[PDB]
Write a protein that binds this ligand. Structure first.
Ligand SMILES: O=C(Nc1cccc2ccccc12)c1cccnc1
Ligand SMILES: [Cl-]
Ligand SMILES: [Cl-]
Ligand SMILES: [Cl-]
Ligand SMILES: [Cl-]
Ligand SMILES: [Zn+2]
Length: 308
């Protein structure tokens, strides 16, 4: 016969390249195991002349690739890279319009939760620990958000099409961020002080109102009053089961609204600027106040000490 070869590069992080000489009579799968080209699964495809010099993603199946993969992604989940490529093959087809100066996402594949989460990140002070999220988030800020969206889906174990919860998505992103400074001190009355650190310092479930949190809130044999003693964080995220709630200009940073039923609904994003903007993927509307089924509100913070 004839024995044709081309040079290609393999990678796990798209920075460190590994020279390979491949045989054009055999599948990528036969030579590398699972192989991807900008998200497309090429496992079962033979190399084409047009592939010469291109970078393919492979699985971290030896020690060089494992160390590179862990240093870049901070995960040893063996399905991670497959899940990332699968998502990226869809997210690179989404549109990321600039809406009121923020990178949003045009509705597709039930992605409203991601669009609100992405708009929220652009309004709060947060730095990611994995280089993969640092690099993708920098590009997402500049308007090329496909990698960042595909990484969020991979790190949160969501496939394209699956509706997620904004609070849970933010929770997972927060676990991969530098929130070590963050500290909350609470008191309860039936006294009992507690101290929360990192992610648990910036999140509360039960009330949307930061004001109401500082004054105190009823909770579980009769009732008890919980209130905010001290807060050290650049923001706080107040969450509750979706319920009609009134948002007013200048009283909050941003918020997520959830309409519809369990596992069949739609998020919109409200931002407080010169007035209230409702951002619904590519869609933009304004009002002086906003009433809706709110589930999350974000507030700016630095340092707070009670006067109780
Ligand atoms: O119920 C939801 N979110 C939640 C909000 C508040 C409290 C919750 C408690 C348990 C489960 C989901 C909750 C939900 C459902 C479908 C899509 N997105 C979100
Ligand atoms: Cl996917
Ligand atoms: Cl949706
Ligand atoms: Cl970052
Ligand atoms: Cl991390
Ligand atoms: Zn009691």
């Amino acid at each position: 016969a004839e024995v044709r070869t081309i040079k290609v590069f393999t990678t796990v992080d798209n920075i460190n390249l590994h020279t390979q000489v491949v045989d054009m009579s055999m599948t990528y799968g036969q030579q590398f195991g699972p192989t991807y080209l900008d998200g497309a699964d090429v496992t079962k495809i033979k190399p084409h002349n047009s592939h010469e010099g291109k970078t393919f993603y492979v699985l971290p199946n030896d020690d060089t690739l494992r160390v590179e993969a862990f240093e870049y992604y901070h995960t040893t989940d063996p399905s991670f890279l497959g899940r990332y490529m699968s998502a990226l093959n869809h997210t690179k087809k989404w549109k990321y319009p600039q809406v009121n100066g923020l990178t949003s996402i045009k509705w597709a594949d039930n992605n409203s939760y991601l669009a609100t989460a992405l708009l929220t990140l652009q309004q709060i002070e947060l730095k990611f620990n994995p280089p993969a999220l640092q690099d993708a988030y920098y590009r997402a800020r500049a308007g090329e958000a496909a990698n960042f969206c595909a990484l969020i889906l991979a790190y949160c174990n969501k496939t394209v099409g699956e509706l997620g919860d904004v609070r849970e998505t933010m929770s997972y992103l927060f676990q991969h961020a530098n929130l070590d400074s963050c500290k909350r001190v609470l008191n309860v009355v039936c006294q009992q002080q507690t101290t929360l650190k990192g992610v648990e310092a910036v999140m509360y479930m039960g009330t949307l109102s930061y004001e109401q949190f500082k004054k105190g809130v009823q909770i579980p044999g009769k009732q008890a009053t919980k209130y905010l003693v001290q807060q050290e964080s650049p923001f706080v995220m107040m969450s509750a089961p979706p319920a009609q709630y009134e948002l007013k200009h200048g009283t909050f940073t941003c918020a997520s609204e959830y309409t519809g039923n369990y596992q069949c609904g739609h998020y919109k994003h409200i931002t407080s600027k010169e007035t209230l903007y409702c951002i619904d993927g590519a869609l933009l509307t304004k009002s002086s106040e906003y009433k809706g089924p709110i589930t999350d509100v974000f507030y700016k913070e630095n340092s707070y000490t009670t006067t109780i």
